[PDB]
């Protein structure tokens, strides 16, 4: 059981890491294109 | 024991709907026969004035080729370039100043806009 | 004073247009329909406003105005026995006005301007008066609702209003500089009320349950956490605490609660609850109710509104208990607001600043000296509901690092008809050592030692369960049989308590102390007898048991006599035992 | 069995005829009214 | 009517128009294209520079010259009437059965006004759903939000159809005596297919339940925004009926998962940052606004009870949608794949199924007084029987005591008859009697959760009707 | 356009025992077959195209390896149609789109295939569509969105992907043409999720639309046990409505036998949890009987040899007879164990050689072998007494 | 790398078992590099120059220290040259790719610099198409005696199969050969585990008239027995060794002997007949009735051989 908990929490942490990575990427690209379209006005 | 009342109710509703659509067809008949009667100029003038007042700065007053006599003077004094068009029966078409907007004002437009509001009083006068 | 129009309705609850003089975090009436909004981002002439209700139906060109004030709550007489929403609006008057539905764009005053109150001045013209000093006296449901100078007001009295009887808008006292002190005032929600000094938790807050008041005490101004499992009857415990504690004032707050909350939060409190003295409990009660489908801003600000009211009543000169109904829904509302503000998540989608908000809320409670020199205390009992019963979620982490006591509920405990279903194993309290001296000087010198002895007995009984279940109880040894029997007797006759009974509902400190003394005396006699040679079965049928276990339903006056006679009966039992 | 459905029909046509004939005598005023509001 | 031309941008489901100051937020517009076809769209943004239009249809005929934009309504409303009973609508308010449009008594906003908390009251009366396991262990109560948890292949639609065409109340059981309460069902379909549509038509037509039924049907291929609008329309109709004509409305939502998917895609279409698990951060409040507009009030006789149906995405309960549903609702009825595989209908799993207000829905005046104790005893006995059944697979029935074999037999009979009620319709009395007969298999005295009086009153009857009669 | 939609009431043949028995698909139905690489999707699609019952088969290779297409092209002209006997190529129409072909052609190929399928349906035929991959379609959509600079949805897929998939799948059905003629289209969709992830968005959007679902697993593929259908994770929703057709066409009690087979499999799967913690020796004999019967069913009825020239195509009647004899044998084994007879002697009974070797018997000779099996099975238990 | 070098050295068709063609001209090896290390490069150069084949093998070296972007062009140039050779002069060409991980590195870097829409772990979303532009440039053409065979080498980072690169490659290619760390630690070369391995064109390379007809049955029986042995190992991990029956120990012996002999070969070169005789000897261990997948005649005319008769 403790090994199962260890594997579960490790995988959960990895998936949370990927989620945070892709959401930061999306916000960054949205901000970049917003700024560029605004300066192109 | 129950399908009977369902079929009775649906027959009643479809009969009422048929009567209502007949009323609508009669209304359309009454509307499309107006121009022969000499009350046509008054209708076209009302539509023109309401279209122009709802569209500030209108540059043009589109109309029918056969509707020049009743609206030409008003269009000229308003300071717009009016032109003819075989379309827009029973109404006039205002044009915005920028040319990107317009208001079309045929009677059928008002009729099928306000038919849904009509339905209540039509029902309660037909059967109330 | 600042007026503008609407430029860009970019979606739900988003506005922007030139509002040059607007300042940060001001409540704004928006549109011709007068929707309430808050300014969160100033840029150039324009500024952004977030609306509480959905912005459906609006269009550009609608005028926008600012109230020049942040979020604030009106504090004055007439707030007791009332019901308010998340943003301090009267629900009953709204019901009478706009019907069963809460229509958007309705305006209501928190304090009714019609009811007149008997004014009683306390100063004469020419006297110096500072913020926090007492000024007037008004009765409200049995006790005086005093009148306080606003915290940031200082001056000399020009003239006072005569005794008379007046409405809330009537300005009673005018300072020499010309300002007019109305019967009430307002305080911004996100600024703690100023205090002279903060004191220490050197006195206990008497809840009324033996298990709580003994094993996990909470001092005057501490914080407590309880889980929210279904079937444990948290309503019963909450009601018992509200009506049996030593707190002068009880404030109930519920944010983001399930749909069927009125079932127990709006029917029993008005009627089913009666204080130890008087008629209805409602006359000394204030509620902030906010169901799920209310706009998120209320679900987020209700906690601050409640704690602000609590601080007001603490500076008033009373003792107030504040019960947050649920913080999981509050964190849910915080996460929704974050998703509205597009701040990147930290863990499980929660904003990084969650712990800061929890600390800034939970630190407001305590026992302090008011600005008027009086003593008061705000004590908070916060409830947290884990998403699946797991404490590992971040909100429980941030809560357990700031609470002084964390009681444990469980549906299984009540599944075996044991009430109150307060787990006595995982719970902890950090008020014990500081409360030890007062316990010694007011209950018994050995009282902490008795508590430690009962804790040791509980630990021993817990450490022997598996050898019982695996093998069978009756097949064990006489010492172990004795310890199991005494642990069972304790856990079924001292920890347990009925709530609905007239007698058992409330229990003083010394009643529990004497009960523990009798139980431990019987335990000592039993140990002596079994070591001597007398078996467990005779002990099981000694005449002392059916009387000592029956002590729960005796009144306070008779307890000294019943206690001394039961001690003598224990003495006589050993004479039969040896 | 089926006589119940038989008079189900019979009164269904009865109701349909009743509503149609009741309405047919109330058409002119409705047409005039509708034409009145629709024309400004 | 005003026409806005000047299309400047076309991409996917969004297009821009200029000088549209007279278009309020959320207003619905039509699109007249070169071919003359009239499309639909909702304005999702407005500004002095221009306005944004989202189009819930295909865009394979547009251009920048011949396309025109005009308004049809300030706010998406719905025309309602009482005579709508028996009709079927396509989710945007269009009848589809083939009868002329109804006459609206009054037009209402789809997004209703939230209910004042002081108006509500404690629910007290149940509903005889017709399914014995539901009617005994998870007794539905008026004004309750009781969801049903489905599986990948489990037949939720058939269960919904049976509940809809078997539901009724029991005034005679209470002190009411005679029947006087009008009753109706509002049925919502979101993201359904041809097979489901045809099956629902047949089920609601053959048995004659349509005449008291209202249907809102939306195909899967149909646009997403219509799927968004449909549940709000259903709830609006239900609220109006209940609070203006004293009806009791039993609302059914066939899918919340398709609704959530459509909401997520629509939110992403506006370039909005997603939150936890990629779903919108506000999905909790939207689910609440759909669910929470149901209950009982004071001074009125109406009552809205709601049974949303959702399928767990991968049989999991930690998914955000069922987690939020558990936050909002008052329990759940968990279907089990095992019983469906084994051949039992309907595959309802009593072990994890749970209700919350059921404690106040059973008892004398509301039901018979033996409801709660019998339910608890049955639950515990079934748990024991299942455990001992798994134990016998290694030990063996020879090496077990009497009560273990009696539990094994009782559990087998329980899962063979009490849960396998099939297409038949039962009453509360028959379910209670069958439960009594099944408990009669167990030796007396074991029923620790049952008082002596009821044991003396009812114990002894055995299974007689179920095997001899349908 | 179509005149009317008709409820599906006739099964669509596949030629595979497990597919055409446990998880049937109606004439106008849809069935998704996702899985990881190496599960043998190419063989499955090829066999389904070869041995179907529809008149015209439309093959759509949406972004797949060209070698399989070349094998099909050079192989079909050497196979007689099971229905007419002509070269199978005449009834088969192929749409070719290799992986290295330009990206923007995959969606066009898919739409061309579905449109041609609808056309041949309108002509009054039976049409079976093989969309060899939808993950390639989704990848092309994502690639377009990449340089379109939109705000992508979950996992970088465009938001309208679910709507596109729904529109693609919904075109199938059994309808009456504008000329008043009956026809149908069958869609066999395949998904290649990244790394065998059945939880990916596209597959989940599929599970909420299609009425039949099939699954493949790596462990069975390693054992080479084709078709390698993970029975636990696969389900069908067309089973109920097909009962009267089965009764009138194959056997009156066939559905009951199928449900008994499913019950046996379910009990075996339930016992597997205890098996994987205690071992088979500690169990009772009557439960070892269940385990071994499940093994026999797995390795003698579900398994099919995709290359054997006699067992490649199987009729429904043959599988029905196999199931009948299997269940009869199991019931007799239960009755014998009821008489204190152990299981070890049962596993040594020689009739199991016939049971295993049965499936290789030709189509027409099968009834005689089935009669011999019935009498031998009855004797093997009755003679021992 | 050693496996690739050995395969290149020993590869040759067997027309004697088919009868068509009698030239047996050795293959032309094409070496393409993507960030190779110096040690591996020296190994490959020494092997190819020892084999006596460098006179007919084109090497496209691209070291690690070389500029990163140049990795994007070496595979394409190598494939173009190989295709030109094979389809202009019918040379039988075998192509060796040094590393695809560096190709993915360069592609991901150039894509991220352009800020495209990434994939699962930041890889470009058109990586599938990019790899299809490479791998599908292989095979044979109707009416020509040329041949193009690709033997790419890629490294799973965390010994992982769900990684985007191996997953996409397996989707694109017809089967693969996977190695195993546990076998490598136990001193076995080559550490090829037959379970995860697969070749989709197996059925077209066997049968009567090509090698021998009993190939398929032998292979499938070996897979079945090995899978049984693995499951029995897993069961023994808990239940121990005492409760094992006779046939379970038989399967365990078959599995461990199989791993020790059939897989472990120590750089020696075997013909198809030697391997088939070894396989028959291994199968002789199991009871003759357990070979349910094998036809009776093959068992009759091939079974019974004992292991020590192959070597002592």
Author numbering:
A (entry chain G): 169 to 209
B (entry chain L): 61 to 188
C (entry chain B): 1 to 578
D (entry chain K): 81 to 120
E (entry chain D): 5 to 474
F (entry chain A): 194 to 578
G (entry chain F): 161 to 472
The authors write:
V/A-ATPase is a motor protein that shares a common rotary catalytic mechanism with FoF1 ATP synthase. The V1 domain of Tth V/A-ATPase (A3B3D1F1) is an ATP-driven rotary motor where the central DF shaft rotates inside the hexameric A3B3 containing three catalytic sites, each composed of an AB dimer. When powered by ATP hydrolysis, the V1 domain rotates the central rotor against the A3B3 hexamer, composed of three catalytic AB dimers adopting different conformations (ABopen, ABsemi, and ABclosed). Here, we report the atomic models of 18 catalytic intermediates of the V1 domain of V/A-ATPase under different reaction conditions, determined by single particle cryo-EM.
We obtained structures of three rotational states of V/A-ATPase without nucleotide; state1 at 3.1 Å, state 2 at 4.7 Å, and state 3 at 6.3 Å resolution, with the DF shaft positions differing by 120° in each case. Using signal subtraction of the Vo domain, we achieved resolution of 3.0 and 4.1 Å for the V1 domain including half of the EG stalk in state1 and 2, allowing us to build atomic models of the V1 domain of these states. The three AB dimers in the V1 domain adopted open (ABopen), semi-closed (ABsemi), and closed (ABclosed) states, respectively. The Vnucfree in the ground state is activated by the binding of ATP to the catalytic sites.
